[PDB]
C-alpha cells in the first residue's frame, strides 16, 4: 500500500479494518443480535483490499 494515502483510506474506509472490527463493541454486539428483523449490515462499509 501507500503509507501516505492510508490516513485517507482508513478514515473513509476505502481500505481500512473490516467494519465488524472498528465499530464500538456495543454496536457490533447489538447489530448481531437484532439482525433477524432490523438489519444494519448495509449501513456500514467493510473494505476489500487486493
Amino acid at each position: 500500500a501507500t503509507p501516505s494515502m492510508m490516513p485517507q483510506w482508513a478514515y473513509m474506509h476505502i481500505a481500512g479494518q473490516d467494519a465488524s472490527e472498528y465499530l464500538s463493541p456495543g454496536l457490533v454486539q447489538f447489530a448481531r443480535a437484532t439482525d433477524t428483523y432490523f438489519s444494519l449490515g448495509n449501513k456500514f462499509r467493510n473494505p476489500t483490499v487486493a
Partner: protein
C-alpha cells in the same frame, strides 16, 4: 500567509528523458468537507495533516539529500547501476590439438580482459579444456537520468509550507513544467 496543512505537490515523470517534470498540488485526492460540522472538519484536517507528516518522514528516509530539486543530470554514483555477475564461457575446441590432427591427415567433423582457467563439447584426442571469464558490465558507469523504480523513491510529494513568501529568487522554480534550470528562465515557442 498559508494553511499550515497544505496539499502536497505531486511530481510527474517524463519517462523519455528520464527526469521529472513539474508539480501541482494533488487536485484528485481532496475530500469535500463543505457540508460537515466543526468536528468532522477537524477530523478531516487531522487526516490531512497526518499525511503531511508521513510524507516528510518518507522523504527523509528515502530521498537522496540534494541541494537542488529535480537536477538536470544525475551523477553516476547516485543512479542505480545494474551490475551482473562475471560471465564464464567454456571454450569447446582445443586450438593446438585440432591443428596437429588436421595437419596429420585426420579430417575432423561434428589490455588484458580474460581468464584462461583450466578445469583439470569435449573431444577424445585431447583432455585439455579452458574456461573463459569475462566482465559483463558496462565499460563506464551511466550517469544520465533516473528510471521508474528510482523515481518513486527520490521524488516523494513535497509539502510546501507558507508557499510564496518573498524573495522571488527563492521560489521553487522546479515546480514549473517548462522551467530550464540551466539558463534559469522559462522557455518555449508554444
Amino acid at each position: 500567509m498559508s494553511k499550515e496543512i497544505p496539499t502536497p505537490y505531486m511530481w510527474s515523470y517524463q519517462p523519455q528523458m528520464g527526469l521529472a517534470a513539474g508539480a501541482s498540488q494533488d487536485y484528485s485526492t481532496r475530500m469535500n468537507w463543505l457540508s460537515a460540522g466543526p468536528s468532522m472538519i477537524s477530523r478531516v484536517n487531522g487526516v490531512r495533516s497526518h499525511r503531511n507528516q508521513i510524507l516528510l518522514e518518507q522523504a527523509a528516509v528515502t530521498s537522496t539529500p540534494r541541494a537542488k530539486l529535480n537536477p538536470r543530470n544525475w551523477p553516476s554514483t547516485l543512479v542505480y547501476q545494474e551490475i551482473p555477475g562475471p560471465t564464464t564461457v567454456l571454450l569447446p575446441r582445443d586450438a593446438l590439438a585440432e591443428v596437429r590432427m588436421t595437419n596429420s591427415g585426420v579430417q575432423l567433423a561434428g589490455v588484458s580482459s580474460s581468464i584462461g582457467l583450466r578445469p583439470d563439447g569435449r573431444s577424445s584426442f585431447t583432455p585439455n579444456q579452458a574456461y573463459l571469464t569475462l566482465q559483463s558490465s558496462s565499460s563506464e558507469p551511466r550517469s544520465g537520468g533516473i528510471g521508474t523504480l528510482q523515481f518513486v523513491e527520490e521524488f516523494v510529494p513535497s509539502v510546501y509550507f507558507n508557499p510564496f513568501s518573498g524573495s522571488p529568487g527563492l521560489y521553487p522554480d522546479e515546480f514549473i513544467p517548462n522551467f530550464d534550470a540551466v539558463r534559469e528562465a522559462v522557455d518555449g515557442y508554444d
